[PDB]
Amino acid sequence: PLVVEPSYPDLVINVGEVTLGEENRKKLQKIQRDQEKERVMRAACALLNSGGGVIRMAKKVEHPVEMGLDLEQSLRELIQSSDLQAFFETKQQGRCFYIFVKSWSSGPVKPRLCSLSSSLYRRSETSVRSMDSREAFCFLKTKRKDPADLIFQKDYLEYGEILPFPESQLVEFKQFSEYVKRTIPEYVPAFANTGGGYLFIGVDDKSREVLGCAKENVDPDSLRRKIEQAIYKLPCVHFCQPQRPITFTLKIVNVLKRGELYGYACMIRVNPFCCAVFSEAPNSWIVEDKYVCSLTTEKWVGMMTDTDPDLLQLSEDFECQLSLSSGPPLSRPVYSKKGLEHKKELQQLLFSVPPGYLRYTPESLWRDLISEHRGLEELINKQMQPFFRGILIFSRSWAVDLNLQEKPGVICDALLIAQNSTPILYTILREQDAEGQDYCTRTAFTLKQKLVNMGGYTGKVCVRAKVLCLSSPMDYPASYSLAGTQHMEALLQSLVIVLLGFRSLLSDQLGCEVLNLLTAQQYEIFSRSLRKNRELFVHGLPGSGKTIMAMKIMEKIRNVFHCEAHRILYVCENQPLRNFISDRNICRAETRKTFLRENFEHIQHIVIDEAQNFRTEDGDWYGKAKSITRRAKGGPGILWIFLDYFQTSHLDCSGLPPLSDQYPREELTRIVRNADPIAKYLQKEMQGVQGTLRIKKYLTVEQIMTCVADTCRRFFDRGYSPKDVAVLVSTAKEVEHYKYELLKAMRKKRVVQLSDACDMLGDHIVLDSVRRFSGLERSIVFGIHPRTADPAILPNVLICLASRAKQHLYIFP
Ligand SMILES: Nc1ncnc2c1ncn2[C@@H]1O[C@H](COP(=O)(O)OP(=O)(O)OP(=O)(O)O)[C@@H](O)[C@H]1O
Ligand SMILES: [Mg+2]
Ligand SMILES: [Mg+2]
Ligand SMILES: [Zn+2]
């Protein structure tokens, strides 16, 4: 079997012994030549889809060689072209021979996967054949949006009778003999996938005279079960519903010699299939940990057919930084809300290319490292002399920045990008360690994999690991080194998406793991080390991202502190928000009441969100929070606090501690959520995208409900779903009357759906009290009489209403 070796900084496949050189190769018999060609083909196919790699063939001949005539054409067919140099390069090291395989790139249409054979067949006039990836993709995309019968109806035939028509796109005749097996998969998929038709078994293929083997050959009662089992064993795939099995019919007709029963003949009719049917699983491969495993039929067909999803908040305001229609196979699409920074503006702002000097980065972090640590400057300025220009990106650990546990004893990591050299990964160990090399190797491994899986880098990239200290790689070919400004900028841009990318909340509404790009401010906040920032009172406007960074930080804490995901405790005020965050299972979750009630003896890290809506009515939460966090055996765990501090009174004794004691501090100063008019109006009250703001006054409750029903009708007439709307009121006790009123007024338009905020899973309009609802959001929000029934809830409730409406806000004061 193919074996994957872990000790390398990029994916390496060793195929065992191989003999190359056409003069040397052609001597070998096929039962070995083709076997080894197929092993190498498995390797190459696997790596062209799994984000690139290196193939490592061993040999027992030491002189230089050349690609064999068979392999240099199998690679061309597999890549679907003769431009081998673009994807494969040859370099050998004596008895070891390497070919370095880029990662496939669907973008300039070319398909999204590379596979030896698609296993799909179709009838072309008189011929049957397999399909190549381009034709397979065209066919799958297309299916994503009588003389024969008068013979079939005959119940018997005589030996030697000539059938009146030849073979065609509709029919075939097959001579008989073991032959009762394997004969069906050859032709049946060909007919089903297009046109449908018949195949006659027991009839000469050329003379067309019936022969029907003989009595001793066929037992119809067994042949029927055999043929049906063979038919229904062939894998199929559907995009439609319900899943119809293979539609077919059979006749096992007695056939006579001189009028005497002499044998049997079979006529099988195959009807056009509503979807694609595969003779066998496509011969395609993708490599997982330690194993290069085949792709299943459903996985294959799904992968080849994926495309960028569309919806109201996926279009006209979201910009496609990466697409499934131009990136590698395994890349998830990425987006960035219109009006924020792209991937381009972000790397300019974070990793701008110098013209003539090797800029370090991040400047502040370099300052902290050099001041903190003795001789780091001395150790590094030596090993930066050769490289001329580029960037050197530092961090206190590149493992935790890529979702791998930070290692004890690491001083920092650094990525070295420079012109006329490959990117290089530096880790500066505090002291030499036996296991130290493993950390740098695996970190290089994962950074490389992410740079082309998550990064979406169509280009040709390699990463190398170096272990420094304060106290035999693959000689990648010459073309993998950054040859100018353009390619350096491309690689930096596809590092921007490795770092600033996070799993969007639209993954719930779409199912696919759509990634999204942070802002500069949030990245600045997120980059802070944890072991030096045990406490932090983050600020920011409402709807600016506090929840995002909160969620991210329970992953970062889990990585850094080696703690199980259940020891990190979240806290909040509203049950709906805790519901929205409880299911992620990245943490244990609570609300402030039970937070005081419960005895958290197993908690070691706390992240308090929307803190400004807390209250002392049951006791003190801040004191207990410090008591828990600071009692940890392993040292004081995080106690990050989030909150809102627009220019409005917080009040309360524990409406955040005294403002002079809120330090250290950070500021997320942008309202990404809402649209322009909502942002414009929302700013006035606190004193890039279209939307609507509608305030109506002096309307009766009857008129108000008529208007909201009419607007729901209008929006659903434009694609908005039941889950795209919300109608909110002041208090919970006011919910009951208005629920009934709305369900009534909606009768005139015969709308039916209404459910609370707790029932968030169903596609129903959500109605609840704002204080209860706070923490969530919907595309359209209706406000029914927001009023200061209890000014203990921060008096500015018109903000907690207008902050929930992404694109359309309707206010009824
Ligand atoms: N980088 C980003 N680009 C675009 N939109 C983003 C980004 N980060 C977050 N958002 C969106 O902005 C909104 C704010 O979400 P989040 O819950 O984190 O904010 P918040 O200020 O904590 O909210 P709340 O106070 O209402 O609980 C969400 O719709 C979120 O999907
Ligand atoms: Mg024929
Ligand atoms: Mg929030
Ligand atoms: Zn179907």
Residue numbers in the entry: 7 to 114, 121 to 157, 188 to 219, 225 to 518, 531 to 746, 772 to 897
Paper text:
Human Schlafen 11 (SLFN11) is sensitizing cells to DNA damaging agents by irreversibly blocking stalled replication forks, making it a potential predictive biomarker in chemotherapy. Furthermore, SLFN11 acts as a pattern recognition receptor for single-stranded DNA (ssDNA) and functions as an antiviral restriction factor, targeting translation in a codon-usage-dependent manner through its endoribonuclease activity. As a subgroup III Slfn family member, human SLFN11 has a tripartite domain architecture consisting of an N-terminal nuclease domain, followed by a linker domain and a C-terminal helicase domain. The N-terminal domains harbor its tRNA endoribonuclease active sites and the C-terminal helicase domains of the dimer are able to interact with ssDNA.
This resulted in a 3D reconstruction of monomeric SLFN11S753D with a global resolution of 3.72 Å, allowing model building of residues 7-897. The SLFN11S753D cryo-EM sample was prepared in the presence of ATP, which is in line with the observation of additional density in the nucleotide-binding pocket, suggesting a nucleotide bound state. The conformational change of the ID-region between SLFN11wt and SLFN11S753D is accompanied by a rotation of the entire helicase domain by approximately 140°. The loss of dimer interface I, as a result of the rotated helicase domains, likely destabilizes the dimeric state, explaining why SLFN11S753D adopts a solely monomeric state in solution. In this conformation, SLFN11S753D is unable to bind ssDNA, but is proficient in ATP binding, though not in hydrolysis and has diminished tRNA cleavage activity.
